[PDB]
């Protein structure tokens with residue numbers, strides 16, 4: 001897709017800190033950009049939409065190539081249309097924003113410049129951030145994660161994509177998403193099937209795959225940490241159901257691991273660690289700090305801080321495994337206890353290390369789940385399972401929770417605030433910010 005300028009594109013600024021082993025942190029200045037799917041897509045020569053509701057213009061978009069040549073992405077009114085605002089080192093995303101139309105959440109990427117994404121090399125380093133999830137009830141997900149996206153949004157690889165990172169193009173994740181309107185410089189109109197429950201979405205013939213590191217997927221009820229390996233580390237197109245993931249009939253028939261080696265304290269047995277109120281170790285009605293460390297062995301460590309008290313990731317006992325570190329033994333024990341084999345089939349942490357060794361783009365999003373109602377995160381899943389089934393219970397939410405139309409109507413004012421992002425070598429982010 002090309003870029004049009006009927007509406008100006010001004011990326012909201014966002015500062016963060018880069019720390020060093022020497023014990024000092026320095027301020028960096030970046031900005032955020034909204035994903036291309038949220039934008040107005042219209043003809044390059046007029047204001048006629050190329051996409052409207054959940055269908056494509058059959059004349060402007062008869063096929064993937066022609067559509068890309070005829071259509072462009074336009075600017076976004078961040079605050080008024082998408083409920084996205086920033087202030088210093090803080091970013092807030094509103095759940096439902098009402099303007100000309102109704103908008104639900106957002107997916108944003110951290111930029112290095114106005115035209116490029118900021119790339120982070122996680123291996124050997126640690127990432128820290130403060131988060132307020134108090135306004136996120138059952139069914140919602142305020143996420144912060146990394147994906148192996150190209151710094152330019154794919155422009156250098158795909159000439160027909162001239163909009164680039166400035167317009168939030170190039171997304172990919174372990175689900176090999178097929179809902180993306182533009183992939184590899186082309187539209188995703190061929191094989192397009194409109195969603196039955198979402199008036200704005202559909203599923204196309206192609207998907208976009210890549211490694212994904214889910215640092216944080218959570219609400220006030222549950223939280224999970226999950227690495228997802230893929231046989232191909234970076235962004236790669238996929239065909240139909242061979243994509244696997246949430247958008248295909250076969251979830252595990254692809255090149256990426258859509259499940260990952262997840263670590264949810266509640267799912268692991270500690271139902272008193274994270275939740276709303278003082279009866280939990282970490283009170284989700286208050287802001288907290290989340291620190292994730294990527295050691296060179298490929299293992300991942302985690303600790304939290306609230307009101308100046310530090311808590312390491314709670315110990316878990318699963319099969320022959322015991323400890324609080326996400327390593328090869330944990331992931332193997334999890335597959336043995338909870339079942340499944342996609343993580344190991346995709347290479348596990350060894351394959352995943354290839355992603356963290358390279359650059360990864362930071363993503364912050366707020367969304368509700370039109371496919372599984374977020375039950376996999378905060379309820380019992382599958383819903384027909386009982387508490388006696390290992391790993392079925394992931395949270396205290398009712399199995400009837402998370403219906404999009406319902407949560408959007410009942411909790412429109414929900415929101416998430418991410419702030420004070422700090423990145424640097426292991427053991428450095430806890431030091432004084434510059």
Ligand SMILES: OC[C@H]1O[C@@H](O[C@H]2[C@H](O)[C@@H](O)[C@H](O[C@H]3[C@H](O)[C@@H](O)[C@H](O[C@H]4[C@H](O)[C@@H](O)[C@H](O[C@H]5[C@H](O)[C@@H](O)[C@H](O[C@H]6[C@H](O)[C@@H](O)[C@H](O)O[C@@H]6CO)O[C@@H]5CO)O[C@@H]4CO)O[C@@H]3CO)O[C@@H]2CO)[C@H](O)[C@@H](O)[C@@H]1O
Pocket residue numbers: 037038039040041047049051052053081100101102103104105106107143173175177179180200201246365366367368369370
């Ligand atoms: O027409 C002439 C006038 O145009 C005006 O401009 C309009 C334009 O016409 C109109 O088309 C445009 O409409 C856009 C809406 O403003 C916008 O809200 C809407 O956003 C949708 C988006 O369509 C949809 O693809 C997206 O799907 C989400 C999904 O909800 C979410 O559950 C899922 O979540 C993932 C997470 O993000 C991720 O972190 C996690 O790992 O996985 C999750 C599961 O996959 O993500 C998908 C996206 O991949 O939802 C959003 C939000 O509801 O998009 C509309 C276009 O399709 O609005 C323009 C502005 O009003 C001009 O302004 C006027 O001057 C002209 O005259």
Ligand SMILES: OC[C@H]1O[C@@H](O[C@H]2[C@H](O)[C@@H](O)[C@H](O)O[C@@H]2CO)[C@H](O)[C@@H](O)[C@@H]1O
Pocket residue numbers: 175214217226246258259260262376377381
């Ligand atoms: O695709 C949504 C969500 O899936 C998560 O994997 C789930 C999977 O959906 C479920 O079938 C299985 O039983 O449990 C796993 C772990 O909760 C995945 O970890 C998320 O990253 C992803 O957003």
Ligand SMILES: *[C@@H]1O[C@H](CO)[C@@H](O)[C@H](O)[C@H]1NC(C)=O
Pocket residue numbers: 269270271272273281311312313314315
């Ligand atoms: C849950 O984790 C917290 C923090 O590590 C710990 O104090 C508490 O004893 C754990 N509770 C259970 C039931 O394991």
Ligand SMILES: [Co+2]
Pocket residue numbers: 206239
């Ligand atoms: Co094809």
Ligand SMILES: [Co+2]
Pocket residue numbers: 295297299325
């Ligand atoms: Co270790």
